[PDB]
C-alpha cells in the first residue's frame, strides 16, 4: 500500500516498511537476512550523515570561493591547508584515526552488544552511551536538545527526513566527483555555466559523458 | 441535466454541479481527491480574478497611453512622471511586505475556514465570509452578493476563464509580433491575409536579457522562436 | 483560549499557556521535552535581559558619544586598567555570578543563602526570577510584568541583531543608520542595495576592516556569514 520505488511491483518480504526510507528497494536482496539488514541500516546512516556534512561543507566553501572570499576548491583544500598552516600530513592523519578509532570502536561494540558502553567504564559516563535504537544513539550528548525525547510522532518524521536528505547528499557527493572529473571545475562553476546557457552547457555537451556525441 | 463540455461525455462522479461553472471537465482527474479540489478551486479563483485585472489593465492602459508598450511597462524608465527611475528594490519592498500579509491572511482562511474573519487591531469588524474564496462584507460594499449569488459566481468564473485565455493571447501575441492587443488587432484588419499567425509564429521579439538599474534579468519567449 | 503567534492556528501540545509569553510558537518542537524546556526557558530570559541592556547601552552611547562607533568601542576605549587587567576582573566576577545562577537552576533553593552574612537569605522563588534583594520594587502584578519583560526582551534580541547586520552593511550606528533610511526610504532598504537573480548575485561590501591592530596584535574582524549575504 505504501509507495515503492517501482510502482506496481510488490515490495520484497524482508522490507516490511518499519524502517525509515523504506521504499521496497533491494533488487539484489542484499539485506534479506535480518542480522545483515541491521548492519546495513547503520551503514546507510553513517554514510548519509557523512555525506550530508561533506555536501554542506563543499557547498559553503564553494560559495565563498565564487564570491571571492579566498576559499579554495574542495579538490584543492587539502593541499592549501597543510602548506598554509605548516601542518605535517602524516601527523594529522594519525590523530584522525586515533579519535575516529575510539569513537568508531565504541559504536562498533554497541552494535555487537547493545547498551554495553553504558556500564560506566568510560570516565564514569553511563546514560549518554546507552543508545536508543540501531543507528540512533540519542541521549544528552548525541541529542542535547532531546528532540528524540519529546513527541514520538515528530521523532518518526525527523527519521524520514534524515535518511531522505542523507540519500540525496550521497548522490550529490557522487555528482561533485563526477563533475570535477568531467569538467575540471568546482560545483558552482558548473552551476553558473549551466545557468548562463542551459541548452548548450550540460553533460551532453561536455565531451566526456557521451563519447559518441 | 446541465450541459457538459462535450456531447456524449459523462461527467466525473465527483463533479455534480455544486460549484459554479461546472461542465464536468476533468480529463486528468486532478479533482478526484476531495482535498485537492478545494485547493484547486481557490487557485482557479485567484487566476481568474488576477487575469481579469490584467486584461483590463492592458486594454485600458493601451487606450489611455498608446505610446507605451505594456510588455515593457515594467522598466523603471517607462514609469509615469512621479515614479520615473524609482529604485526598483525599494518598490519591491512595499509589494513584498503588503502582499505577504494579505496572502497569508487569505491562506490561513483556507487552512482553518472562518478563523481570520475579524480585524486584528479594531476588534468587532468582521466579514461574513459565507464561502471560502468569497469574503464579502467590506469586500462587497455595494451588496450585490445579497441576491442570486450562485448566478453571479457562474458569471464570475465564466468571465474569469475567458480572461485567463485572453491574457495569454496578449503575451504570445506580444512575443510573436511585439505589439499590444489593440495594435495587433489593427494590424490584422489592415492586411488580414498578409499579417496573421502563419507568418509571425516563427519570430520571438523579446531580447535574451534586459538591464534594470544594473541588474540583468533573463527573459524568454514561450517557445523557441527565431530571435 | 489565548492569543497566538499565528491567529487561527492550533498551538503544539507541549505548549499550554503556563509560561509567560506563551503564544504557541514552537514549529520545530524544540521544547517538547520537559527537561529541555526548563533549560531553554532560563536561557531565553538571560538572552533577553542581556539584549535589553545592550540595546539600551548602544543607543545611549551614540547619543552621549556620537563620535565613537559602538562597533569600534572595544578598541577605541582606553583606560588605565589595561586590556588584561579588565579581562581578569571580568572573568572572576562573572564566574562567581554565573556559577551561583547555574546552581539554582540545577538544584533550586540551594544558593539562596548569603555566603558571608548568615542573616541574609533570598525568600523562596521560581527559577529565573530571584526576588528579595534583586526586586526591591515591583510596580504591579508579577504575572503582567513577566509578560512585559519577555515581550520587550524578545524585541531587544531582534534589535541587537539588527544593529550588528546594519553596522556591517552600513558602517553606522543604529540612529545614524535610521536617519539614512529616513532621508531616502526608497533607496536605503536591504532590497535597494542587494539582489540575487539566476545568473547574477549582487551583495553589499562589508564595511568593517578584515582585521584590527590593537596594542601590538592583530584581531580578526570578519563580517558574519558574508559569503551568504544576499
Ligand atoms: C573522504 C575522503 C577524502 C577524499 C575523497 C580526498 C580527496 C582528495 N584529497 Mg584529501 N581527501 C580525503 C580525505 C582527506 N584528505 C586529507 C588531506 C589531504 C591533503 C593534504 C591533500 C589532499 C588531496 C586530495 C586530492 C587528491 C588525492 C590524491 O592525492 O590521490 C592520490 C593518492 C591516492 C589515490 C592514495 C589514496 C589511498 C587511500 C583529492 C581531491 C591533495 C590535494 O588537494 O591536492 C591538490 C592534497 O595535497 N587531501 C585528509 C587529512 C588527513 C583527509 C582525511 O580524511
Ligand atoms: C558580549 C561580548 C562581546 C561582543 C559581542 C563584542 C563584540 C565586538 N568586539 Mg568586543 N565584544 C565583546 C566583549 C568584549 N570585547 C572586548 C574587547 C574588544 C576589542 C579589543 C576589540 C573588540 C572588538 C569587537 C568587535 C569585533 C570582534 C570580532 O569580530 O572578533 C572576532 C572574534 C575574536 C577575535 C575572538 C572571539 C572569542 C570567542 C567568541 C569568545 C571567547 C570566550 C572566552 C574564552 C571566555 C572567558 C573570558 C571571560 C571574560 C568570559 C565586535 C563589535 C574589535 C573591534 O572593535 O573591531 C572593530 C576589537 O578590536 N572587543 C572585551 C574586553 C574588555 C570584551 C569583554 O567582554
Ligand atoms: C553506501 C550507501 C548505502 C547503503 C549501505 C544503503 C543501504 C540500504 N538502503 Mg539505501 N540508498 C543509498 C545508499 C545506501 N543504501 C543511496 C545513495 C540511495 C539513493 C539512490 C539509496 C536509496 C534507497 C532506497 C530507495 C531504499 C534503500 C534501502 C536500503 C536498505 C535495503 C537495501 C540494502 O540492503 O542495500 C544494501 C546496500 C549496500 C550493501 C551497498 C552496496 C553498494 C555497491 C557495492 C555499489 C553500488 C554502486 C551504484 C550502483 C552506483 C550508482 C550510480 C548512479 C547513482 C549514477 C539498506 C539499509 C531500502 C530500505 O528499505 O531502506 C530503509 C529502500 O527502500 N536505499
Ligand atoms: C566531514 C565534513 C567536512 C570535512 C572533512 C571538512 C574539511 C575541511 N573544511 Mg569544512 N565544513 C564542513 C564539513 C567538512 N569540512 C561543514 C559541515 C561546514 C559548515 C557548512 C564547513 C565549513 C567550513 C569552513 C567555513 C571552512 C572549512 C574548511 C575546511 C578545511 C579545514 C578544516 C579545519 O581546519 O578544521 C579544524 C577546525 C576545527 C577542529 C573546529 C571545529 C578542510 C578541507 C576551511 C577551509 O576551507 O580552509 C581552506 C574553512 O575555512 N569548512
Ligand atoms: C494588477 C493589475 C495591474 C498591474 C500590475 C498594473 C501595472 C501598471 N499599470 Mg495598470 N491598470 C490596471 C491594472 C494593473 N496595472 C487596471 C485594472 C487598470 C484600469 C483601471 C489600469 C490602468 C492603468 C493606467 C491608466 C496606467 C497604468 C499604469 C501602470 C503602471 C504603474 C503606474 C504607477 O506608478 O502606479 C502607481 C500606483 C499607486 C501610487 C497606487 C494606486 C492605488 C489604487 C488603489 C489603484 C504599471 C505598468 C500606468 C503606466 O504608465 O502604464 C504604462 C498608467 O498610466 N495602469
Ligand atoms: C508538428 C508541427 C510543427 C513542428 C514540430 C515544427 C517545428 C519547427 N518549426 Mg514549424 N510550423 C508548423 C508546424 C511545426 N513546426 C506549422 C503548422 C506552421 C504554420 C503555422 C509552421 C510555421 C513555422 C515557421 C514560420 C517557423 C517554423 C519554425 C519551426 C522551428 C521551431 C521554432 C519556431 O519558430 O517554431 C514556430 C512554429 C510553431 C510554434 C508551430 C507550432 C505547431 C504545433 C506544434 C502543431 C499544431 C498547430 C495547429 C494545427 C495550429 C496551426 C495554426 C492555425 C492557424 C492553423 C522548428 C523546426 C521556425 C524555423 O526554424 O524556421 C526556419 C520558423 O521560422 N515553423
Ligand atoms: C551589556 C552591558 C554593557 C556593556 C558591556 C557596555 C560597554 C561599554 N559601555 Mg555601555 N552602557 C550600558 C551597558 C553596557 N555598556 C547601559 C545599560 C547604559 C545606559 C546607562 C550604558 C551607557 C554608556 C555610556 C554613557 C558610555 C558607555 C560606554 C561603554 C564603554 C566603556 C565602559 C566603561 O568605561 O566602563 C567604566 C566603568 C565604570 C566607571 C563603572 C561602572 C559601574 C556600573 C554603573 C555598574 C552597573 C551594575 C549593573 C547591575 C550591571 C548590569 C549588567 C547587565 C546584567 C545588564 C564600553 C564599550 C562609554 C563609551 O562609549 O566609551 C567609548 C560611554 O561613554 N555605556
Ligand atoms: C580568525 C579566524 C577566521 C577568519 C579570519 C575567518 C574568515 C572567514 N570566514 Mg571563518 N570561521 C572560523 C575562523 C575564521 N574565519 C572559525 C573558527 C569557524 C567556526 C566557528 C568559522 C566558521 C565560518 C563559517 C560558518 C563561515 C565562515 C566564513 C568566513 C568568511 C567570511 C566571514 C564570516 O562569515 O565569518 C564567520 C565566522 C565566524 C563568526 C567565526 C569567527 C571566529 C573567530 C571569511 C573568509 C563564511 C564563508 O564565506 O565561508 C565560506 C562562512 O559562512 N567562517
Ligand atoms: C553514492 C553512494 C552509494 C550509493 C549506493 C547505491 C546506489 C546502492 C544501491 C543498491 O544497494 C541497494 C541500495 C540495494 C541493492 O539491492 C541494489 C543496489 C543497486 C546495489 C554513497 C556515497 C557516499 C558519500 C559520502 C560518504 C561522502 C562523503 C564526503 C566527505 C566526507 C567529504 C569531505 C570533503 O569534502 C569536504 C567536506 C571538503 C573537501 O575539501 C575535503 C573532502 C575530504 C573531500
Ligand atoms: C493570472 C493570469 C494573468 C495575470 C496578469 C496580470 C496580473 C498582469 C499584469 C500586468 O499586465 C498589466 C495589467 C500591465 C502590464 O504593463 C504589467 C503586468 C504586470 C504584466 C493569467 C492566468 C492564466 C491561466 C491559464 C491560461 C490557465 C489555463 C489552464 C487550463 C486550460 C487548464 C486546464 C485543465 O486543468 C483543467 C481545468 C482540468 C484538467 O483535468 C485538464 C487540464 C487541461 C490540465
Three-class HEC string of A157-189: HHHHHHHHHHHHHHHHHHHHHHHHHHHCCCHHH
Q: Residue C189 is nearest to which of B90, B112, B218, comparing CB atoms? A: B90
Min Cα distance C35 → chain A (Å) is: 9
B120 interfaces chain C, CB cutoff of 8 Å: yes
Q: Count the Cβ atoms, other than its own, within 10 Å of residue A38.
A: 15
Which candidate, C228, C204, C198, places its Cα nearest to that of A61? Answer: C228
Q: Residue B89 is nearest to which of C6, C9, C195, comparing CB atoms? A: C195
Which candidate, B223, B95, B227, B226, places its Cα nearest to that of B171? Answer: B223
Contacts of A192 in chain C (CB under 8 A): 199
**Whole-angstrom Cα distance, residue C174 to residue A143?**
38
Name residue, grid cell 556559577: C99
C125-134's contacts with Cβ under 8 Å and 24+ in sequence apart are C127/C38, C127/C42, C128/C41, C128/C42, C128/C45, C130/C104
Cα-only R_g, chain A: 21
Closest Cα in chain B to C4: B120
Name the experiment that determined this structure. Answer: cryo-EM
Interchain proximity B112–C8, CB inside 8 Å? yes
3-state secondary structure string, chain C? CCCCCCCCCCCCCCCCCCCCCCCCCCCCCCCCCHHHHHHHHHHHHHHHHHHHHHHHHHHHHHHHCCCCCHHHHHHHCCCCCHHHHHHHHHHHHHHHHHHHHHHHHHCCCCCCECCCCCCCECCCCCCCCCCHHHCCCCCCCHHHHHHHHHHHHHHHHHHHHHHHHHHHHHCCCHHHHHHHHHHCHHHCCHHHHCEEECCEEECCCCCCCCEEEECCEEEECCCCCHHHCC
Assess contact for C101 and C108: CB atoms under 8 A.
no
Is the Cβ atom of A21 under 6 angstroms away from ligand 3?
yes
**Whole-angstrom Cα distance, residue A173 to residue A50?**
10
Give the distance (Å) from ligand 8 centre to CA of residue C43.
25
Whether C81 has a binding-site annotation, put simply, is yes
Is the Cβ atom of C74 under 6 angstroms away from ligand 2?
yes
Q: For C197, list phi and psi in degrees, rounded to 5.
A: -130, 160
Resolution in Å, one decimal, please.
2.3
Q: Residue B116 is nearest to which of C7, C191, C193, comparing CB atoms? A: C7
Distances C36 to A158, A175, B23, C50 between C-alpha atoms, Å: 18, 39, 56, 21
Assess contact for B170 and B180: CB atoms under 8 A.
yes
Bin A45: left if φ > 0, else alpha if -120 < ψ < 50, else beta.
alpha
Alpha helices in chain B (DSSP H): 34-64, 88-111, 149-177, 181-190, 197-200
Closest atom of ligand 1 to A79 CA is 47
Distances A175 to A71, A178, A182 between C-alpha atoms, Å: 21, 5, 10
Breaks (C-N over 2.5 A) in chain C follow: none
Min Cα distance C63 → chain A (Å) is: 35
Residues in chain C, total: 230
In sign, the C-alpha dihedral spanning A115, A120, A122, A126 is positive
**C33 burial via Cβ count (<10 Å: 0-12, 13-18, 19+):** buried
Kind plus residue range of the DSSP H or E element containing B212: strand B209-212
Cell numbers at B199, concatenated? 507568418
Report the half-sphere exposure of C130 (CA within 13 A, side-chain side). Answer: 19
| Helices C174-183 & C142-170 angle (0-180, nearest 10) | 70
**Whole-angstrom Cα distance, residue B53 to residue B160?**
10
Cell numbers at B100, concatenated? 505577504
DSSP state of B210: E
Interchain proximity B108–C193, CB inside 8 Å? no
Cell numbers at C104, concatenated? 539554582
Q: Which residues of A are annotated as a binding site?
A: 5, 23-26, 28, 39, 44, 47, 49, 74, 104, 107, 138, 148, 155, 161-162, 164-165, 167, 179, 183, 194, 202-203, 206, 209
Whether B26 has a binding-site annotation, put simply, is yes
**C173 burial via Cβ count (<10 Å: 0-12, 13-18, 19+):** buried
B84 interfaces chain C, CB cutoff of 8 Å: no
Distance of CA C96 to the CA centre of its chain: 21
Cell numbers at B197, concatenated? 499567425
Min Cα distance A146 → chain C (Å) is: 6
Q: Count the Cβ atoms, other than its own, within 10 Å of residue B219.
A: 12
Q: For C148, list phi and psi in degrees, rounded to 5.
A: -60, -40
Amino acid at each position: 500500500v505504501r509507495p515503492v520505488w517501482f510502482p506496481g511491483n510488490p515490495p520484497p518480504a524482508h522490507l516490511d516498511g518499519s524502517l525509515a526510507g523504506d521504499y521496497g528497494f533491494d533488487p539484489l536482496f542484499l539485506g534479506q537476512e535480518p542480522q545483515t539488514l541491521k548492519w546495513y541500516v547503520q551503514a546507510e546512516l553513517v554514510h548519509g550523515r557523512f555525506a550530508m556534512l561533506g555536501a554542506a561543507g563543499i557547498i559553503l566553501t564553494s560559495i565563498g570561493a565564487k564570491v571571492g572570499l579566498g576559499f579554495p576548491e574542495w579538490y584543492d583544500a587539502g593541499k592549501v591547508v597543510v602548506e598554509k598552516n605548516n601542518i605535517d600530513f602524516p601527523t594529522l592523519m594519525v590523530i584522525q584515526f586515533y579519535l575516529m578509532g575510539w569513537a568508531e570502536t565504541k559504536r562498533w561494540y554497541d552494535f555487537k552488544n547493545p547498551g554495553s558502553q553504558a556500564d560506566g567504564s568510560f570516565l564514569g559516563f553511563t546514560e549518554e552511551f546507552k543508545g536508543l535504537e540501531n543507528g540512533y544513539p540519542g541521549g544528552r550528548f548525541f541529542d542535547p536538545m532531546g528532540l528524540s525525547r519529546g513527541d514520538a510522532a515528530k521523532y518518526q518524521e525527523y527519521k524520514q527526513k534524515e535518511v531522505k536528505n542523507g540519500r540525496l547528499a550521497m548522490i550529490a557527493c557522487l555528482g561533485f566527483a563526477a563533475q570535477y572529473a568531467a569538467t575540471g571545475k568546482g560545483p558552482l562553476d558548473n552551476l553558473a555555466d549551466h545557468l548562463a546557457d542551459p541548452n548548450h552547457v550540460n553533460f551532453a555537451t561536455n565531451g566526456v559523458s557521451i563519447p559518441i556525441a | 441535466d446541465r450541459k457538459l463540455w462535450a456531447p456524449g461525455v459523462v461527467a466525473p462522479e465527483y463533479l455534480k454541479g455544486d460549484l459554479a461553472g461546472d461542465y464536468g471537465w476533468d480529463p486528468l482527474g486532478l479533482g478526484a481527491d476531495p482535498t485537492a479540489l478545494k485547493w484547486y478551486r481557490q487557485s482557479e479563483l485567484q487566476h481568474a480574478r488576477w487575469a481579469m485585472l490584467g486584461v483590463a489593465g492592458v486594454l485600458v492602459q493601451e487606450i489611455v497611453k498608446p505610446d507605451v508598450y505594456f510588455y515593457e511597462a515594467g522598466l523603471p524608465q517607462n514609469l509615469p512622471e512621479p515614479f520615473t527611475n524609482i529604485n526598483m528594490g525599494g518598490l519591491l519592498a512595499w509589494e513584498f511586505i503588503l502582499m505577504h500579509w494579505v496572502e497569508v491572511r487569505r491562506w490561513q482562511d483556507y487552512k482553518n475556514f472562518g478563523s481570520v474573519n475579524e480585524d486584528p487591531i479594531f476588534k468587532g469588524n468582521k466579514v461574513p465570509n459565507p464561502e471560502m474564496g468569497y469574503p464579502g462584507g467590506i469586500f462587497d460594499p455595494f451588496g450585490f452578493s445579497k441576491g442570486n449569488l450562485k448566478e453571479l459566481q457562474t458569471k464570475e468564473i465564466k468571465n474569469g476563464r475567458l480572461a485567463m485565455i485572453a491574457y495569454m493571447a496578449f503575451i504570445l501575441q506580444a512575443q510573436a509580433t511585439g505589439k499590444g492587443p489593440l495594435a495587433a488587432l489593427s494590424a490584422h484588419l489592415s492586411n488580414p491575409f498578409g499579417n496573421n499567425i502563419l507568418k509571425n509564429i516563427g519570430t520571438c521579439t523579446v531580447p535574451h536579457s534586459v538591464d534594470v538599474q544594473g541588474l540583468t534579468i533573463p527573459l524568454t519567449c514561450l517557445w523557441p522562436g527565431s530571435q | 483560549s489565548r492569543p497566538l503567534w499565528l491567529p487561527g492556528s492550533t498551538p503544539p501540545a507541549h505548549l499550554k499557556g503556563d509560561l509567560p509569553g506563551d503564544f504557541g510558537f514552537d514549529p520545530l518542537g524544540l521544547g517538547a521535552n520537559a527537561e529541555s524546556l526548563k533549560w531553554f526557558k532560563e536561557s531565553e530570559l538571560v538572552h533577553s535581559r542581556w539584549a535589553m541592556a545592550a540595546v539600551a547601552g548602544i543607543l545611549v552611547q551614540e547619543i552621549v558619544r556620537p563620535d565613537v562607533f559602538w562597533y569600534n568601542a572595544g578598541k577605541e576605549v582606553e583606560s588605565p586598567l589595561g586590556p588584561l587587567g579588565l579581562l581578569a576582573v571580568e572573568f572572576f566576577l562573572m564566574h562567581w555570578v554565573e556559577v551561583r545562577r547555574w546552581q539554582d537552576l540545577r538544584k533550586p533553593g540551594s544558593v539562596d543563602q548569603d555566603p558571608i552574612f548568615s542573616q541574609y537569605k533570598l525568600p523562596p522563588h521560581e527559577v529565573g526570577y530571584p526576588g528579595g534583594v534583586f526586586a526591591p520594587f515591583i510596580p504591579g502584578d508579577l504575572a503582567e510584568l513577566k509578560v512585559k519583560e519577555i515581550k520587550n526582551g524578545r524585541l531587544a534580541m531582534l534589535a541587537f541583531v539588527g544593529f550588528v547586520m546594519a553596522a556591517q552593511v552600513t558602517g553606522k550606528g543604529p540612529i545614524a543608520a535610521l536617519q539614512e533610511h529616513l532621508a531616502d526610504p526608497w533607496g536605503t532598504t536591504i532590497f535597494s542595495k542587494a539582489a540575487v537573480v539566476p545568473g547574477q548575485a549582487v551583495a553589499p561590501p562589508c564595511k568593517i576592516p578584515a582585521s584590527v591592530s590593537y596594542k601590538g596584535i592583530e584581531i580578526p574582524t570578519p563580517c558574519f556569514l558574508q559569503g551568504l549575504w544576499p
